[PDB]
């Protein structure tokens, strides 16, 4: 065997093939077809209702640039926060709207979004701004659809990918055009084995999706072709010649408009001719409502109600049909958080990550900045805690001495009722106490 | 019966038949009636 | 996972960092892939696991490469007689799993396949010749005209012929809906259910479908912790051996310190433990004197909100209390 | 592959095809014919009852115009504050009713209202008013139909919404108005992809809908 | 939505009055709405009267304003208190 | 190898042979393709012939689906719960089917033990009786060591116990000033949280205290 | 009856014939209709 070495030695692995990865064997579920296969999967309401509550989380949080830990109160690492969160206000969209474009992964399982810069000038330039101070801020961060993008670009030998490429032919109609790594932010739902394309959360509910539409399906057809219970009219054949008297054609028009026009009412009654054979003993007329003998052999409606059960377990997703609960909270800050939460948990804390190591990093490159730390972005919570519970836990804790109270106890118990910090200049005064 | 589409709009002319409450494509027109 | 590493000379390199010091860091720790591990190479009589060789072939195209045990960690899910591919979760439910999928595909195909009520008409076989008078290849494509566009609407109805032969007393024409006489001797859907369940039962994770009782919790500091809670706080102590005796070992040796002890990598838990039990528990055992208050209780009393350890030089002052 | 540069190398990757947007296949769910299966959809109980407990939630709330934050004090923000209350009851038309307007894209995805401004002389002019400071306010902000609008423009590449046409050919009898993209205010439900026409909420209950009406149509005949 | 409305009525409405008006302020004011329907009352009672006995909460006349919000009374009024001549 | 529903066919003898008319052998042609692919469908109908024997009174063709009579005289799905119930019931681990009950507990140091953590109990003490009898005296031995006495290992609990019920019992019987009170106690009293024995240099002060 | 697909499509042709509310491939038609 070889000695041990410093530096790589083997590869990932990865199934590429002439730029298209081929880590799914489903046809279905591939590059090409994917585009269209998860479109169907989004009209059924259960897969539908199940992305639209995780992508609704994720929108309700706010976001915030504060100074890295370590150094909270340096005024440096102030202004920096300042800077950062200017920044986030002076494209030419709201951040809401990027967040939201962002989540567009919950589908696909990834997102492609290009960084464009801008020069703080005020407004003599292409991107206009309301600052003059001349650094280098954000312009825009345009998605790039996933329907579009046809090539991944590797390496020598398929150790990262290196740029991307994106065909305009069907859009309206360069009509190609090639981005390198550098220049776009990747967000994936899932990355493991370092899949570039990640994996969507829709391929758990491949299966029970395709199961319920065909029964779905079925049970619509089965309902529309029911039969039983409608008239019939038997006539000799001579009845219905082209030729025969005018008697008996006037007769089968007789019979037509009365099985177009029949109908269940307060006059319904038939006066109707009867002669039975001498020699057979069977009426030669008849009029009778067609009747069935067996019964379906089985019963859709509760495979159909199996499999939406089983697509809403999925997603873990089970609030939809059951309520919420007063066992389960959508808090991280409450000791009650179900299942739900914390994989949203799980999602912000991808989006932070990656924001904070690819976005930021560059910006303090291109302002040509060494501050030995770099500002974080950091979020909030999805719903404030219990109260209860929280006021007699602090109760009880600090009675006793056991806990000490601190300005920053305080600012954080304010948080749970929306109010700021402190104020230290406007108490609540004697003349309007009683 | 009801199995033709030129039939059953040439059937409906006639004045004097019995007038139903709801037919079968009451569902999908845009314009009512 | 392989391990690279690299000199912190800030970015004269190929690979760069943040720092300048000259040391010895981490570059990246990357995967390989499980399908491409192809041979496993054990020391002369098998006692030990001395490398591996990893296949190239057949991913997209030297095509073959060999690492020594010393160059990679490896976690195992667990490691009975010290087999390196430990032992997949997944052979618990294989049987469950097996039957259940197989059910499912014999009971969508005969919901394809039930057929009870169709339409079906019967003629003489003189109907059906190709030579038929033109009268009678008419009524037949009004037969098919029929049978393809009948459906339940208000106008539904039929005017048909009726003839029953003198000498047999049976309608020479006919039309009906097909019948059928048992029933399915097994019902699929309590037999599918039950494999589901015992799948479930496998993981220990039937709160999926229990929901989250009021019983169990997802906390390890909290008296209600759940099996599957126990078996993750397995995994991560599994994950933590293995990086504590496999990473940091190498990285002193690599940087040439010895210090008598390495510095551990710990985790933290799940989620916080319920506050009102703690609470009462904390007055109770501290207002008779019975457990000693140290600044290193009230920083763990912290911890389960969320704060910092403490401030010693910002108080709430009497200037905002009432 | 290309060095790295500032400003944009790519595009949106609309489907737009002369001027009408083709994300949706189904042509039952396109402009020309969206107008008609939305108001088909909304005849449902269970539909007409979602959307309007949630256009009820929304004009239950107040609105107010308050300093921006940093300078919550400061004399000057205040005044502001204060000009910019006066304005929203100084329109031709309440600004609840404004608000309901807004809501119609509950239904349709999407909606615009067009920007109308007029000096605060008091009376003397084609727009009144209670003031007099000879300022610049809102006279209102009315809507424009969604069936009435026809093509959108884009920049050369389609990077951006240049504009809207307006066609008023069977609105009770120029017939064709156009409005650049500064002139109005654009709404939208969901702007994945950035999709000038957003997605309307019915998307999801199509096919529940479809089904529902027609079984009971089907058991209505056969009781019939 | 909500939030949705107030973020293009703050980045499209406002910013084009203030460029009409050939105003510059450095900050421009924002519209903000109200909520849908008041808190419950016997949670936040109990809290406040839990963390302020201990002298955990720094009492504030913003928070006395907050409080007072959720019965629909104006913030405060520091001229006319309840009087002893009406106190048994 | 449930087969009721299934179509079947029949036909004269003659129209299976292999030397038949080619009418007959497209005839047959088009049963086999009707036979493999008919599904329910809102087509789904058929066309068939219809002929009455005049002696007889059968017709020589049919169109029908297998019936059967009869039902299955056992139902597998209570005997199959039956016998999982009792597997269960052999390790006394029915635990994973009914949830964690509030009677039961998995600490040993409650007083409300399930059965799995008594015998798991069991378990822990023979692995520590063996290591302590088989591997540190042989250790001893081999480094030339006689001390009166060996270190014995020994391990930890399961689960903490309930917090509630140990506070209540702790208040209870301190206040009547009938337990004694030692920094021992203090000691395991602060185990239960995961805290280390005590620290005599870093008490909360004054300065942090309302 | 629907046993062809080659027919079922050449009788879609037939102008005269009834609508129906839901086909068989309904449920995976990308295009609709």
């Given at each position: 065997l070889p000695p041990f070495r410093m530096?790589?030695?083997?590869?990932?692995?990865?199934?590429?093939?002439n730029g298209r990865i081929?880590?799914?064997?489903?046809q279905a579920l591939r590059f090409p077809e994917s585009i269209k296969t998860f479109q169907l999967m989004m009209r059924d309401p259960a897969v539908a209702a199940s992305v639209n509550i995780i992508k609704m989380f994720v929108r309700k949080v706010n976001w915030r640039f504060v100074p890295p830990?370590?150094?909270?109160?340096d005024p440096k690492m102030l202004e920096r926060a300042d800077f950062f969160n200017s920044l986030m206000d002076d494209?030419?969209?709201?951040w809401a709207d990027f967040i939201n474009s962002v989540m567009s992964f919950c589908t696909y399982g990834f997102c492609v979004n290009e960084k464009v810069y801008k020069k703080r000038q005020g407004k003599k330039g292409k991107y206009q701004s309301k600052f003059d101070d001349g650094l280098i801020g954000w312009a825009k961060l345009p998605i790039r659809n996933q329907s579009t993008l046809d090539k991944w670009y590797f390496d020598e030998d398929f150790r990262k990918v290196t740029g991307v490429r994106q065909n305009l032919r069907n859009v309206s109609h360069p009509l190609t055009r090639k981005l390198p790594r550098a220049k776009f932010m990747l967000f994936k739902y899932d990355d493991e084995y370092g899949n570039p394309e990640g994996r969507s959360p829709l391929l758990n509910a491949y299966v029970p999706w395709k199961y319920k539409v065909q029964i779905e399906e079925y049970e619509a057809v089965g309902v529309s072709r029911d039969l039983v219970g409608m008239p019939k009219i038997g006539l000799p054949p001579?009845?219905?010649?082209?030729?025969?008297?005018p008697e008996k054609k006037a007769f089968v028009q007789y019979c037509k408009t009365v099985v177009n026009d029949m109908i269940a009412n307060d006059r319904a009654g038939l006066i109707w001719p009867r002669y039975i054979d001498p020699d057979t003993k069977e009426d030669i007329f008849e009029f009778s409502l067609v009747s069935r003998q067996g019964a379906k052999a089985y019963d859709t409606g509760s495979i159909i109600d199996r499999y939406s059960k089983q697509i809403m377990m999925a997603f873990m997703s089970d609030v939809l049909a059951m309520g919420q609960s007063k066992y389960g909270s959508f808090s991280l800050a409450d000791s009650k958080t179900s299942l739900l939460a914390m994989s949203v948990d799980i999602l912000l804390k991808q989006i932070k990550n990656v924001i904070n190591r690819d976005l930021v990093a560059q910006t303090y490159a291109l302002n040509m900045w060494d501050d030995e730390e770099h500002v974080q972005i950091t979020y909030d919570d999805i719903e404030t805690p219990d109260l209860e519970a929280i006021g007699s836990y602090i109760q009880k804790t600090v009675a006793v001495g056991a806990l000490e109270v601190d300005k920053e106890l305080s600012n954080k118990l304010r948080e749970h009722i929306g109010?700021?910090?402190?104020?230290?200049?406007q108490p609540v005064s004697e003349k309007l106490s009683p | 019966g009801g199995i033709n589409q030129c039939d059953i709009d040439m059937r409906r002319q006639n004045p004097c038949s019995v007038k139903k409450y709801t037919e079968y494509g009451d569902a999908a027109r845009y314009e009512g009636r």
């Open positions: 530096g790589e030695v083997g590869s990932l692995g990865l199934k590429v093939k081929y880590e799914e064997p489903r830990k370590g150094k909270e109160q494209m030419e969209h709201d001579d009845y219905l010649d082209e030729n025969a008297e109010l700021p910090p402190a104020d230290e200049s | -």
